[PDB]
Amino acid sequence: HETAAQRYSARLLQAGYMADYLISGGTGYVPEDGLTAQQLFASADGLTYNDFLILPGFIDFIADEVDLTSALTRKITLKTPLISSPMDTVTEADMAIAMALMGGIGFIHHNCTPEFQANEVRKVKKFRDYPLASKDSQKQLLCGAAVGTREDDKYRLDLLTQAGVDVIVLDSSQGNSVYQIAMVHYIKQKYPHLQVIGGNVVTAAQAKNLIDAGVDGLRVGMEVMACGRPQGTAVYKVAEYARRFGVPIIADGGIQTVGHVVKALALGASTVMMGSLLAATTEAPGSIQKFVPYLIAGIQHGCQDIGARSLSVLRSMMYSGELKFEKRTMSAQIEGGVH
Amino acid sequence: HETAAQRYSARLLQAGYMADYLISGGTGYVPEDGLTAQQLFASADGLTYNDFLILPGFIDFIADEVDLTSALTRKITLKTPLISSPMDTVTEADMAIAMALMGGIGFIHHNCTPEFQANEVRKVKKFRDYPLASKDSQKQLLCGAAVGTREDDKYRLDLLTQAGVDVIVLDSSQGNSVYQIAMVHYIKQKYPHLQVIGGNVVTAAQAKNLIDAGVDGLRVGMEVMACGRPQGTAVYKVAEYARRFGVPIIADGGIQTVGHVVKALALGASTVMMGSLLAATTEAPGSIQKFVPYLIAGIQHGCQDIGARSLSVLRSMMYSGELKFEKRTMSAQIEGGVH
Amino acid sequence: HETAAQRYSARLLQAGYMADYLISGGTGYVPEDGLTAQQLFASADGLTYNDFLILPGFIDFIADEVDLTSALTRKITLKTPLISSPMDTVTEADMAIAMALMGGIGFIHHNCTPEFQANEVRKVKKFRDYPLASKDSQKQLLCGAAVGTREDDKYRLDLLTQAGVDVIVLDSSQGNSVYQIAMVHYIKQKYPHLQVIGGNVVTAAQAKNLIDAGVDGLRVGMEVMACGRPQGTAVYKVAEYARRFGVPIIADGGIQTVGHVVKALALGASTVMMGSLLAATTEAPGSIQKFVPYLIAGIQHGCQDIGARSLSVLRSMMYSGELKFEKRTMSAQIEGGVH
Amino acid sequence: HETAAQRYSARLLQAGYMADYLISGGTGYVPEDGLTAQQLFASADGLTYNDFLILPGFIDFIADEVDLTSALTRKITLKTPLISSPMDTVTEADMAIAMALMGGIGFIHHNCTPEFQANEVRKVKKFRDYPLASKDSQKQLLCGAAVGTREDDKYRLDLLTQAGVDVIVLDSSQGNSVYQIAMVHYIKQKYPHLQVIGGNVVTAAQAKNLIDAGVDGLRVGMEVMACGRPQGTAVYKVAEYARRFGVPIIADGGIQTVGHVVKALALGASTVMMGSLLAATTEAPGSIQKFVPYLIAGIQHGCQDIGARSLSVLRSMMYSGELKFEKRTMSAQIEGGVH
Amino acid sequence: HETAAQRYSARLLQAGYMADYLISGGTGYVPEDGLTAQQLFASADGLTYNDFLILPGFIDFIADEVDLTSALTRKITLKTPLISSPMDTVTEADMAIAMALMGGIGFIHHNCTPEFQANEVRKVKKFRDYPLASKDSQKQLLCGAAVGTREDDKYRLDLLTQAGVDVIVLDSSQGNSVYQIAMVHYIKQKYPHLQVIGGNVVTAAQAKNLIDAGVDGLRVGMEVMACGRPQGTAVYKVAEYARRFGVPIIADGGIQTVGHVVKALALGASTVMMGSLLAATTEAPGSIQKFVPYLIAGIQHGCQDIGARSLSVLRSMMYSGELKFEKRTMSAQIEGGVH
Amino acid sequence: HETAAQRYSARLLQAGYMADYLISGGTGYVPEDGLTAQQLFASADGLTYNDFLILPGFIDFIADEVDLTSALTRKITLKTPLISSPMDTVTEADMAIAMALMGGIGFIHHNCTPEFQANEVRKVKKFRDYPLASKDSQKQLLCGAAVGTREDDKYRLDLLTQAGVDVIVLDSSQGNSVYQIAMVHYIKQKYPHLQVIGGNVVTAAQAKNLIDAGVDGLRVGMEVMACGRPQGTAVYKVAEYARRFGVPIIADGGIQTVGHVVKALALGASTVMMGSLLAATTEAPGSIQKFVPYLIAGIQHGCQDIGARSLSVLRSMMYSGELKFEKRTMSAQIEGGVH
What we know:
This is part of a larger assembly, with six copies of chain A.
Chain A: H1 4-11, H2 20-24, H3 37-41, E1 45-46, E2 52-54, E3 70-71, E4 77-78, E5 82-84, H4 93-101, E6 105-108, H5 114-126, E7 144-147, H6 153-162, E8 167-170, H7 178-190, E9 195-201, H8 204-212, E10 217-220, H9 231-243, E11 249-252, H10 258-266, E12 271-274, H11 288-306, H12 311-320, E13 325-328, H13 330-336
Parallel strand pairs in A: 5-6, 5-12, 6-7, 7-8, 8-9, 9-10, 10-11, 11-12
Antiparallel strand pairs in A: 2-13, 3-4
Helix pairs in contact in A: 4-5, 5-6, 8-9, 10-11
Main location (chains A, B, C, D, E, F): cytoplasm
Enzyme class (chains A, B, C, D, E, F): oxidoreductase
Cofactor (chains A, B, C, D, E, F): K(+)
């Protein structure tokens, strides 16, 4: 990507404003200020999205020009980073249709008899004011489904395959298990065309065992539980590990505002799974058709303030140390407003 | 114990999925992530159970298979890590019977005349769904008693011995005293069969003076006081010291949820003393027969998410640096939910 | 400036109270205590004004003697460090007149048609019990105006120039942009007499691109948002960078009490922009004639307790390491009272 | 003082419980645990009494045996460390009498015409069930007075001297001034028998200039203010400096509970100034004859749990690194209860 | 592997020397002492083999029992970790025969015409008092060859293949190049049975680009060059990275004593390349038949003092933090003798 | 510049070896290893060229393709980074001619009468197998001269100007003085075409006062003087400061090997001043015509091992954190050979 110094110096040639080029080429000096993402997380304290800010960059573009295309899996790409969660309160076929037309995807839930989930998937597949639409090679909408890791889910998975599903999410609170790895190996052997998203993970050790099982995406996220992780740290650690293998990450939970979506995206999650913010809308079992454009314009203004032309540019600035972060103690969270 | 890498690589031989064994045997690489318990407490800030999480491991077993057996003293072992506190609001003979039948123990309180405590102990000793029962070599239920460190407690201790008590807890807010050490020396000389649990302690220096007096367990825990400690740090520091001598630790207080029971256990307590969660049940001066199965099933799901087959396996993963921890800033405690 | 040791030892000659002068001249020993401003901000945690205290110095002067003169820009200086913000709820001509008579300045807002702003500026320009008054070389009051970075603002800027405006603030939430830099270059070329204040900035990289565009002052300050900074850290970092070039800084927002005004001043802001504390007074679209003397007397008592004779002396003690700071954990913020 | 290892090992000879003496003499091995007071304050964060705990020691004595004698100045010593503050709401002659009879002292306030303060002082001076009574060489009660640092206070000081006052407190919010140093020099020249307590101070630099002026004690303590300090850090820093010169410290403010009194004493204050806890009692313009015995019994239980036989022993354990401290994060303050 | 605590506690059952097992299973306490390999290299200073010592362990076995088997590549394993370097001064066919019979391997040099190297390889391939012999599946000796990364080396590689070579080393001072990656891709495509060892590398970034090109081993090593690395740091950093992919490391250069062989092996090299210690022997263009038994017996006494039964056990103790290290300042190297 | 990841991934498209591009653009993962130049010098220890190594990169080009063009001043650029020092033992006109023909420059010494230096300058100015030749706008060779900061040097400077000198070096051991700043102001006012190189400096404060005087280059460098600096730290600190203003730096002294030239160049010196290595050659008062090509091929092989296509690309990789460094402890300096 073109760094802020390169973009500034290149556009300073557009009016009447040597040896500097011979000193260090395009790396034409910026004052050192703020932490890199590596320096922010190189400490014992686990961070949530409220504990840090992204520092503003250099703006050379209109916010409506910001590209939001992102990877869901190794083979599937969306035009918008927004996914509707596989919750029974959220995603059935009308919600999955709404999401796919907008350029996201929905994962249909599995608090269903197996034929009912297959019917809702079939209904999404058989469905010019939607430019961004999530469509397959046959121009049908993209559909996700949820599956458990019990034995009877091997039958549910066949019906979802006959319904023409594009991507499966393995639904578990702790995805790093013999049961889920046995399921990923089964799906890859029996359905070699089908994309699988692994479990829930919060550490790079969990992501390793699932990436080694041949999974294509990962879902990051985890009062009385004793296990878990702070969600900003979990998204950053799992994404930094999985990025070594070209596996995309889904940030799931801890998301309440546009600011949390821009932070999750900036930390390496390629897509964000809206859990409840969608619930309580016209489609769930406002209107999506009216509310996702609001989120999308929010993400584009966020990327514009950061000075990133694209979400892949944003993640490339984060891993290279160009994007800078600051930690907020509680009084700094209070003076912005959070609680 | 078999580490997560050893368990993963061993079970990966059960399907069709060299040189790696010659490079480093069974320790076949896990990504570095999270703090060890030594690294978590190697800082000035004292921690309570709310200030940290245990990071999830690798699951290769059913939660109902998890072994909860633990040491109360050098010679007494329970099938469940749960104890009823020696509070007058909590533990008389019917509470101690219900605890022992469930595979815990109760310590009968001493805010009563010496003959009344001896009568309640006699009642426990003389007493279908009970596989786990805490019984002595004569098949009678195990009973604990509380005793003070005044001179007249030397008479109370005789009556508790004639009633056939199995273990004594010396009940004091600051157990590191000439008065308590004189009492432990007296109990050991006069009753060489009787097991003693020392005081309250929160530092390894206090633990030394009582382990040197010949005590068989320690109780860990401590506005008008000025001195004390954060309970997560106190349990770890005293348990790491007492583990050098094979002395078990009881974690007492700061416990409110199943998550705090799993954390106290993971930090090196052998047993947890339910203080008030038992109060306001049918057995106290809900039902113990139904509530401690709920705690037990909760502890077993906690150990399953951690990837530990047993509580002694769990403590062995903690002292070896395999079990990993993350610190939570207040915002991260809030986004999980605590207050 | 004369350090506390130099002033103490000088005044100790005024009553009957060698070789120490030969040991180290006038720097005659003070105990080490507190952090320097560099040591306070040399950490990952971003601070607001609630997170720190200034430590008290040596008092050798009356508070009513403290000099409050400060720079607004490279060429404009005020007798009071206080500015009324360019908000539609705050600053029209009667507010700007009251501010200028009191020895501050007002920036008239621009949520109005270009002729209305030019009329309110003309009204300020055409207007012995005001010693402090902010006047130009023709003895007319000083007036500020706000302007955006759209193309049609090039016409508004002409009408504000015909009205005789003294300084322009470029009004943007993120001032580091091609659009704002193009505007500063336009103002400098077309109106070489006109002073310009740049945008909003919170990092030294932003301040660099605007100082390089030729700006005469900077405005520091920034839930949906994801971008931002803690205001104490932002004022310090941007002022430390701009101070290398002789460019003054305006602290804008995070200001609520006289204590926050003295802290913002002590960290390198040369002027503070009262945003809402002025709103809900007789001048806005109490009385400014009575309230800003209360602020002024409060700032003078603050500088007296700190032991600084002047605000330029105060900033010179801060950059030299003589002025000392202490960080407050939340409990210490509660010990003073803040929420 | 005899350390915990010396006390333990010596008392272990009193029942049937070489080479160790030849290895390390009287040092007997104690496990490393907790911070020293020097290590606790070796960080940027200023601490209140709520931010830390003292760790419990070894007990070999009854709490009723704990000695509370302490220095008020270089020449005056009390049998109890409690002082009534020089507030108009708190200390007139009947309050000062009750305090002196209980073994503290009262400082009479100066929101008085000079003759009225002199009359209340005269009334205290002219006044076996009080063993601890604070009396002078003529067996009259000790009385303190407050004085300001204006010119007309030189007349007030004469009347307080003719009334027979024992000790003067110079009443100012920022004691490190030419005005206060000129007053201390005047009192020492004109009344060479009279003991003076200096100002308010919170740094060792302020303490130096007043100790150099010839003051006999210091008062430590300090929303419109901007400058000040966290009270636990202020008491430790000023007491560590003043200890070098044999000057005692009064801790003033931040005191609410018996626990804050034991912490302020343990951090090196010689005396604590009860500010409002005395207000709203029968003596102020409960009963002091009943309330300060409750404070005294509380301080003695605090020292007993700490294992210190005397307040001078408590301070010697703190400066030698034997007394240990732990920092409380907010969640640990919550689990003990503070807000 | 069985840790020192597990082996000690297991063998303590073999003579007459509970609850400890319930406290932490087999991890029955060892004092903390020395750095882990991760903690040794977690610092800015790069180390040679002289700058550190391995700390001694627990001995439960005879040195003659220590297993020295190790991986050369993903598919080739030797019974001795010793290799003769591809230097013109060292390795022709009689040196390669002596090495292979002893259970090492020799790499024949390439500072000769292609037919001469092919003839020396053919001579090795056509050749019970050698138990350890390095033989292929047809019972011929194993032979290595060196090849460059020029175009004409594609012809040399064919003649070495017709001579029946088992493993190729790509000979370059800086192996991370388009030229070497193009060569590895060519060898893999044209000779899919042939094992390749990559270049020289000293950083994990170089190791990545060659492991991604499909290489089967790596060579680690690098007065007037400006590029390079300290060899102890280079062996550890590249081995920790390559261990993630099951790729073995050859340590090349800086090896002068048996102590340096045991250190290189302990830091994660699978094999060590004797460079000059073999030169000036009967085999080079002493006797290899007598000198490599001296090295082998020295490596076995080194592993015995470390307490490792095998070299794969040794590397597993290093990556798990059971093996401990200490750094040496120059005076500590002098008191052992190194110069 | 194209980073190693961008160059590797771009050339991996040139044979048959998506979604990774959507994760983070072109910055497609490299392992973390080695210090950045900022991290190397962010410690108290001052370094010379022997104390560190540059870690090797990725090679995609031939060494003979490496561009050595560099800035001498703001307006003068050489085709080779080599300068002959202004020493009487080194640089008179035949040495300055030899240097300029090779594409460096010589600075003629001034331990001679003003007319002799002017004659040697005139001789250089009046003078196709030299492609790299350093020539002016009139195709005459470039010549430097040395001048002092005494008053009579104002006459020497006129004769050097009439002789047609291109660049002046102000020759002083400590360049930060009123005498040198007065001289730079004089040269700029009287000869506005003439380029000046400032003194000697080793700190950014010295470089500031000379860069503010209007100097165009700087000379970095400084047995029993007690002032000075380690030359690696001095070159890095002065170059990092002067790079903010586009002022080139000359590394002078500490240079003995081609490895020291590549290190000085990599740390931000744009040119290196060969001091003695040139002395003892045919031109001084081997042959330059034969010895600088050797140095040039050495610098090109150094840049090739580093993976930098140009010296401006090399400095760009250094300031961006792509170029990595390791610190050699003294025994690692012995492992390579240095003494």
